[model samples]
Target: SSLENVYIMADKQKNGIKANFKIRHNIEDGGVQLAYHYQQNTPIGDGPVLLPDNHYLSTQSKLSKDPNEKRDHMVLLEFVTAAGIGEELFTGVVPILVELDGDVNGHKFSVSGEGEGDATYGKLTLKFICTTGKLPVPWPTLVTTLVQCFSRYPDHMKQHDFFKSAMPEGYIQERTIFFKDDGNYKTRAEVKFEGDTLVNRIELKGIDFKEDGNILGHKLEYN
Candidate 1:
């Protein structure tokens, strides 16, 4: 494999779920170095389901590439649900925090979350702390998030129009899969690179069925 960068996004199955991650890498003699930037979006009201919506949750790492020959990258994420009155007006929000150990690609990745309270509307807040450099691999991270989303929507397997539109040209869908644990669902999707950019994305549309599946819709386009 070419010295390529890697990004991963993990979504929660319920309202309150936290995740911690670290990436470890051993740079070869003449291999390309890797870097990362972590970001999260806290929807005011679940934002959009499949639509390419833009919102800020909290980002510890900005955006930058790594230069170290080898190191460990670590991040910690904490989630807190919101509180409100009435079921219709209830809301749930999660905050993400990051903690870094070394540089970008040469680190361990781990994420975990917890749920609290019995409020009608759930709330999740995370603390992002990093001890390394900034900069995030947006494409790979986005791909990870989409895989998590689509794992929950098996009925709409072929509904990949949104990803097909957002990805850059020359990208191709490589592989896709879905699995069930107990009662929850998980999905994974992969795409192959053609030129300088990635051309594949996955859609997991079942995590928050009411909000992501039925409510906010998703779409794709080209530039």
Candidate 2:
């Protein structure tokens, strides 16, 4: 239940004739990624089929955890055919823009695409889930991540607070969130800038949460 390791998983299922294939991100790669394990079976549920040795389709999309202005996390995926390895290959590349939509909850809703020259039509129904903070490591990062995942919720925590204080360079050039889970675990994050904005490096740990910390004592503050 504790915030040990937080990551995103994108599962894809291609629909239509001879399109009985599924792709999933089974492994966590820090934030979110579109890398997948490719596997396909016959259309009639006969048996597993081998993809053509010269399949030209790109099975994975680009990786991104951050969302755009429209609450969309868009990534590029190239395709040659719906079956992934059809006998006919297109002379030109068919690029599909996969959108990973975000919402008020602690997860992402993925909706997919349709095409032509490559003969593609289908959608990916995916769910992005998260672990509720229950004695999570590095309370600060947990608070930050949770706030991000639920940013669209009504009356949610303001993300601006995390950057309200001044930094070393007077402004933030770049910020990245990192994670680690190995027994001795805690979500450790940092701020630094070399090719962009201002740079500030700060460290914090054991910060209290209002809802749960209230059970502790006078040290905890809740309004």
Candidate 3:
């Protein structure tokens, strides 16, 4: 179990169309871990304030008209797992988050961060916010953000088959499981689309471990 530290908070009420997010990651390895020390906290300036270097090594999101278009713009796409072994795994391309703004029609941007150490997935909390309005034909909002980020894996939600109407019956073919009780673990996933495609792929898995093992498997969707 690892992770060490991770805190994400996103808020954008009515004015920004609506967005609310709250994430906390601090699971440690041996000695239990979790006192809070993800670094990046030095403020009391009058002249100098160059904090920067929060922590991060991987983070992605896209939906562009041509902001340079280097790459990334298909829609939901998340990655977190800067190395393995103990505690460190966060694969979320569309594990909820309001399904990436349910069909964002115009002006909707989001970018999150946190990464450092090992390969460096622990010190880079970046955020890009934007909202206004503009989705009329952006490829069905980029195909509902790539079918809600591939419906959070599970073998691509059982080889597609239209996902499964956001799942429900028998939990969408089952197989997506995680059990670790103690600290806290909550999971929720959803994907809905019919006319254009995708019909299901809903999920909900949670786990929390910390006796000295330190393990957490939030939303796994390995590829």
Candidate 4:
């Protein structure tokens, strides 16, 4: 998965309060964590403060069977209740839009006045982007990986006739696996064979992630 930087801005016009923070995702030896940096004059009511201006919080995420679900593969984030804002707080849901590029995935909690009912607090905005391009698979890496896996674990391949006889003798002709970066961006593997020779390559264009499917042992867009 790729590391994403998240920015959140909240404006409560009726309450005369504003909340702005940037979340930095970090991977420690223990697990994944989030570092929150509150902007100047930000109201972080009675929240646990580890430093003069920094705080740490772990995040939770869930994977949905349907990619079109609003919260599909969403990362949930919690912000401290802002002072002078009563009980309203931020519970940001950063949904993973696997079929779309990062640049086009920006979202808003809700429009200024779009049937939010009485529970409406304010306006919220979100911006998420990856630090790099697609997955870091080398040109022939997937083919090499497939060959290595099949050879290293011969016993595991015994149950599959494709790997046992067809793949080795080029009876299957060609095979491919699709991958999504940050579990979102798309990449693919194209492997061709003739007799005992093989030609493996990685291409950046192909179908998007699919439900109940995966690349290798990793679930498609599992992040």
| Candidate No. with top lDDT | 3
What lDDT tens digits, residue by residue, belong to model 1 across residues 115-222? 121112222222222223332221123222321111111223223212222222212222221211101113222432334322223322223212222111111110
After superposition on all C-alphas, the RMSD of every candidate to the true structure, in Å, is: 19.6, 21.5, 20.6, 24.9
Q: Can you tell me which runs of candidate 4 are displaced by over 4 Å? A: 1-149, 153-157, 168-183, 194-196, 205-223
lDDT of 4: 0.23
Report the C-alpha lDDT of model 4 over 9-105, residue by residue, as the tens digit: 2223321112233322323233332223322121223332111112111212222233453421222221211111111111221111111211211
Candidate 1: misplaced stretches above 4 Å?
A: 1-185, 207-223
What lDDT score belongs to each candidate, Candidate 1 first? 0.22, 0.21, 0.23, 0.23
lDDT string, candidate 2, 63-140, tens digits: 222253233322222221111121122122232221212221122222332222222221121212222222222212
In model 1, which range of ten residues has the least summed lDDT? 214-223
Q: Find the 10 residues in a row with the least total lDDT in model 4.
A: 110-119
- TM-score between model 3 and native: 0.20
Candidate 1 matches the true fold with a TM-score of 0.17
Q: Which lDDT tens digits does candidate 3 get at residues 1-223? A: 1222222211112110111122222332212222221111111122221121222222233222335634332232233321111011222211222223322112233322111112122121221222323322222112211221131223222222121222221111212112233333222233333233223332322233433343322222111
Best-performing candidate as measured by TM-score: 4
TM-score of each: 0.17, 0.21, 0.20, 0.22
